[PDB]
């Protein structure tokens, strides 16, 4: 399947996205996994991969995906934000704090990410409160 055009990749992306929307997480994971192998530079594939793993409760695996994603798009707040959610479920408050903090910064610099900026701020405060 190596070397598909951007149109197919785009439609394969749509299928994974839709299966994720449908709660069909294991199927969706498999597609994003495939997309991540086909184009190792497109951050959205790693966002998808991460997301499916999160929903399945595979937090560490989700993190691996989100981390690579963040290197691909240094400005994307969704990566540190959901990374932080995974850290939280795993009982890692420093990771969580560090991700919500970074997500706030990235999100605050981008009007498109306003709602996230506040969720990030709110999660950061909850994490800080838990830490004491």
């Amino acid at each position: 399947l190596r070397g598909l055009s951007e149109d197919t990749l785009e439609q394969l992306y749509a299928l994974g996205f839709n299966q994720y929307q449908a709660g069909k997480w294991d199927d969706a994971q498999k597609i994003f996994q495939a997309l991540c192998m086909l184009d190792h530079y497109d951050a959205r594939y790693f966002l998808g991969l991460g997301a499916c793993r999160q929903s399945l409760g595979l937090y560490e695996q989700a993190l691996q995906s989100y981390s690579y994603g963040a290197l691909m798009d240094i400005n994307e707040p969704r990566f540190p934000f959901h990374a932080a959610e995974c850290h939280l479920q795993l009982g890692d408050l420093d990771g969580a704090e560090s991700g919500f903090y970074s997500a706030r910064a990235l999100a605050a610099a981008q009007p498109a990410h306003e709602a996230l900026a506040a969720r990030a701020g709110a999660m950061l405060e909850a994490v800080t409160a838990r830490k004491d």
Binding site: R44, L47, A51
Partner: peptide, 9 residues
Amino acid sequence: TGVALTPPS
């Protein structure tokens, strides 16, 4: 809440 993925084009 899940993750809000970017919609396909």
